[PDB]
Each structure stands twice: as C-alpha cells, then as structure tokens.
Design a protein around this motif. Structure first.
Motif, PDB file in Angstrom:
ATOM      1  N   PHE A 285     -58.388  17.762 -52.437  1.00 35.66           N
ATOM      2  CA  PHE A 285     -58.017  16.327 -52.622  1.00 35.66           C
ATOM      3  C   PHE A 285     -57.082  16.876 -53.999  1.00 35.66           C
ATOM      4  O   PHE A 285     -57.562  16.747 -54.882  1.00 35.66           O
ATOM      5  CB  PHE A 285     -58.296  15.737 -52.037  1.00 35.66           C
ATOM      6  CG  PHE A 285     -58.684  15.996 -50.629  1.00 35.66           C
ATOM      7  CD1 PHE A 285     -58.227  15.595 -49.831  1.00 35.66           C
ATOM      8  CD2 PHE A 285     -60.414  16.268 -50.021  1.00 35.66           C
ATOM      9  CE1 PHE A 285     -58.428  16.258 -48.109  1.00 35.66           C
ATOM     10  CE2 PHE A 285     -60.855  16.853 -49.192  1.00 35.66           C
ATOM     11  CZ  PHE A 285     -60.079  16.624 -47.826  1.00 35.66           C
ATOM     12  N   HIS A 286     -55.918  15.399 -53.886  1.00 43.22           N
ATOM     13  CA  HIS A 286     -55.381  15.087 -55.401  1.00 43.22           C
ATOM     14  C   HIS A 286     -56.764  14.300 -55.383  1.00 43.22           C
ATOM     15  O   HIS A 286     -56.404  14.253 -57.373  1.00 43.22           O
ATOM     16  CB  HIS A 286     -54.214  14.314 -54.916  1.00 43.22           C
ATOM     17  CG  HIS A 286     -52.867  15.146 -54.843  1.00 43.22           C
ATOM     18  ND1 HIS A 286     -52.317  15.982 -55.919  1.00 43.22           N
ATOM     19  CD2 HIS A 286     -51.762  15.264 -53.104  1.00 43.22           C
ATOM     20  CE1 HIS A 286     -51.059  16.909 -55.064  1.00 43.22           C
ATOM     21  NE2 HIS A 286     -51.349  16.410 -53.908  1.00 43.22           N
ATOM     22  N   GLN A 287     -57.292  13.095 -55.407  1.00 36.67           N
ATOM     23  CA  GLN A 287     -57.778  12.521 -55.925  1.00 36.67           C
ATOM     24  C   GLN A 287     -59.577  12.813 -55.301  1.00 36.67           C
ATOM     25  O   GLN A 287     -59.629  13.496 -54.437  1.00 36.67           O
ATOM     26  CB  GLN A 287     -57.769  11.041 -54.793  1.00 36.67           C
ATOM     27  CG  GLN A 287     -56.477  10.371 -55.850  1.00 36.67           C
ATOM     28  CD  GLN A 287     -56.242  10.322 -56.843  1.00 36.67           C
ATOM     29  OE1 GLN A 287     -56.683   9.773 -57.948  1.00 36.67           O
ATOM     30  NE2 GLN A 287     -55.207  10.299 -56.967  1.00 36.67           N
ATOM     31  N   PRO A 288     -60.612  12.560 -55.951  1.00 34.56           N
ATOM     32  CA  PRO A 288     -61.983  12.750 -56.161  1.00 34.56           C
ATOM     33  C   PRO A 288     -62.757  12.670 -54.824  1.00 34.56           C
ATOM     34  O   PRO A 288     -63.607  10.875 -54.380  1.00 34.56           O
ATOM     35  CB  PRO A 288     -62.093  12.696 -57.033  1.00 34.56           C
ATOM     36  CG  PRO A 288     -61.720  11.793 -58.093  1.00 34.56           C
ATOM     37  CD  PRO A 288     -60.332  11.946 -57.377  1.00 34.56           C
ATOM     38  N   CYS A 336     -63.508  17.269 -55.081  1.00 38.01           N
ATOM     39  CA  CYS A 336     -62.052  17.089 -55.405  1.00 38.01           C
ATOM     40  C   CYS A 336     -61.942  18.029 -53.751  1.00 38.01           C
ATOM     41  O   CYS A 336     -61.068  18.080 -52.673  1.00 38.01           O
ATOM     42  CB  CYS A 336     -61.296  18.315 -55.791  1.00 38.01           C
ATOM     43  SG  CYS A 336     -61.480  16.929 -57.354  1.00 38.01           S
TER      44      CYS A 336
HETATM   45 NI    NI Z   1     -59.359  15.508 -57.970  1.00 36.02          NI
END
Ligand code: NI
Length: 361
Positions: A285-288, A336
């Motif tokens: 994913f882009h965010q954790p 992530c």
């Molecule tokens: Ni991440």
C-alpha cells in the motif's frame, strides 16, 4: 520487486495429472478393494497396513519413482526421514545460500550436521564447491527461499547427480502445482507434507529411490510409526483434488494481479506474484496501513493465520503478514505490505474484501 515464481499448471495440465493419478489407483486397487475403508496395524510381512503399502505404490508410480513411504510428522517428518537415510550424524550437507527452512534447521542441528553453503543460482560455483568440499548429500528447496532465487530445480539436481552427490528435495507447496517434483527431475528422494495437499493431519511422504525408501521403512518399527489405511486413503483423496483446484487458484492469482496492476485499488502501490514461499500475491500500500487492513479483512472473512497452509480447512482467502525472513531483510515492509493466498476464493471476492477493509480503517 523482481521475483521468479514457479511455473503453475494450466487447468488442462492439471486434469492430466489428476487423471494419471487416478489411473495409477485403478492399476493398484481392484474396485472392491478401494471401497474397503483401509486396514489397520502391523500386518505380517509388511509391518504396516496392506492398504498403506498399496497407496505408497500408487504414489511412487504417479511421481515416476521406484518407491514411496508415508511417515508421521508431515513435511518435517519426511525431511527428517529422508536426510537420515542419506547421511550420518556429523556428516556434511550442502545447502543453498539462503535461509534454511526453520524445522529443517532443527533437524540439521539435532543430527549435528556440518553445513556447506553455496549459491544455487550460480551453477559454476555450485559445481566448484561440490568438487572442493565433497558434501555427503545435498538438500534443495523447491519453492523460493528469497525473492532473488531463480534457479531451475532440474539443473541444480543434474549438477549434483553428475558429481555423485545424493540429493533430497523439499517439495512443499510445489507438489501437484508444477510439472515435475524433485524425484521426477533428478533427486534421489522428494519429500512433502500431505496436510498441505488436502490430506490428513500429520502425514508426510517420501518418494524416490528404493534403496533410500527401504532404509526409511527399516526404521519404522513401532505401531505408532505407521500411517493407517484410512489415513493413506485420505492422502489419495486429497491428492486427486489437488492439481485442478490449485490450477483454478493459479488463475485467480493471475487475474487478481492484473486487476491490481490495472489500478482497481488506488490505495495499492504495487503488487507482485511471488513464491513466498508458496505462490501467493504480495500487495503493498501507499500508506502504512497493512496491519489495519489485515484486521479489517479478518472481519470480512479472510483467514488471519494459516493452518497447513493450503489444507482442506483453508477455504476463504488468507490475508497474512509477511514472512519472517523477508521482514528481517526488509524491516519496514511489514508496515506497508501483506501476503494474500486466495485459497478457494475468486479474485472478485479478494478485491472486495481488500476494498471494504481499506474503506473501513
Ligand atoms: Ni507504506
């Protein structure tokens, strides 16, 4: 990241493996005998059930080997029995330059073996090390131990055979999913858990050369050592279902990968198919948000931890953390990225659970 996953069977190829196994069953069991439920105990001359012997004959035949033995301890038990039949305590075992499977390391430690390590991805180095260090046997893992592993099983085995080094393969998560397991492409014995093949708890298989299998059978003195007839029949039942159901899964994984790569889930940064160690999806994913996604996915039916894995129990898709070895090598990735094994589910279900989970964090 770059991976070199094992080559999955197509549905047509998988049917042919299913049919070939059933053909072997027919040739070893008169029909009425297949409907007998499976006998018990230390039958005279065999020291095991008559049906268990027959099943072992079928397994040997189906995997183009001289012989087979079912053993307790599932995959770990199979590797222990195979290694014990190839070398003595304190002898030298060749392994690949990558993390050894944890219970295999335990076996190595309990036998007091000396490890000789070389990069199997470099056949020239493999050949040089074997000639120089003279290992007494070699263990080769079929599935990938690390993302960069790209070696061809048959070629590593051929090199070992040319040098006269007996070789055992750890074929877990590859059996019935690829064209040839170890004993079909150069190994002296293959080993695998039957629990990972829709079969019974605790049962493993060693399949290969008669001299090795006979040495294994000679150690199986006790009543508890034996696999009972009913268990042996359950191994066949699971194995007959394995190739086609996994070919279906392989298709799901490919379709899922394409959808993710096409941007079906904007919150996904990358997706790849990898043998980690079974062939699965790795989704970043882009965010954790990996841990939160895993929590939400479990509520929506995703399995939160494995059993076999790939056992008869594991029907919904598994959404799981990354492997220990990978997390060690890549300490930030666990925040992530996740592993997804679709199991018996379809790609639209996995995508839906993914989307709903992300929306709910
Ligand atoms: Ni991440």
């Amino acid at each position: 990241m770059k991976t070199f996953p094992l080559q999955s069977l197509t549905i047509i190829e998988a049917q042919q493996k299913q049919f070939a196994l059933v053909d072997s069953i027919c040739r070893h069991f008169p029909g009425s005998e297949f409907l007998t439920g499976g006998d018990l105990g230390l039958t005279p001359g065999l020291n095991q059930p008559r049906v268990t012997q027959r099943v072992e004959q079928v397994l040997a035949d189906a995997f183009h080997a001289q012989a087979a033995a079912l053993v307790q301890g599932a995959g770990t038990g199979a590797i222990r029995a195979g290694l014990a039949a190839l070398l003595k305590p304190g002898q030298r075992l060749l392994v690949h330059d990558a993390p050894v499977y944890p219970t295999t390391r335990v076996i190595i430690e309990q036998m007091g073996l000396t490890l000789i390590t070389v990069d199997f991805n470099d056949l020239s180095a493999l050949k040089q090390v074997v000639d120089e260090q003279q290992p007494d046997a070699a263990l080769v893992q079929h599935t990938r131990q690390q993302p960069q592993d790209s070696y061809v099983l048959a070629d590593v085995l051929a090199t070992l055979r040319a040098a006269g080094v007996p070789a055992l393969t750890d074929d877990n998560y590859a059996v019935m999913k690829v064209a040839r397991i170890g004993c079909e492409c150069g190994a002296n014995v293959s080993t695998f858990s039957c629990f990972k093949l829709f079969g019974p708890e605790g049962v493993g298989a060693v399949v290969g050369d008669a001299d090795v299998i006979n040495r294994i059978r000679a150690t199986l003195y006790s009543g508890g050592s034996q696999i009972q007839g009913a268990q042996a029949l359950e191994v066949l039942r699971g194995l007959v279902f394995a190739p086609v159901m996994h070919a279906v899964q392989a298709g799901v994984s490919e379709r899922l990968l394409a959808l993710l790569n096409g941007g079906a889930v904007p919150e996904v940064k990358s997706a790849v198919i990898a043998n980690a160690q079974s062939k699965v999806l790795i989704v970043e994913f882009h965010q954790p948000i990996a841990a939160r996604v895993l929590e939400e996915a479990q509520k929506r039916g995703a399995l939160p931890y494995p059993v076999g894995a790939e056992s008869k129990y594991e029907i919904p898709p598994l959404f799981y953390r990354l492997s220990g070895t990978f997390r060690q090598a890549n300490p930030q990735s666990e925040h992530c990225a996740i592993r997804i094994n679709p199991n018996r589910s379809g790609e639209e279900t996995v995508l839906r659970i993914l989307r709903e989970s992300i929306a709910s964090i």
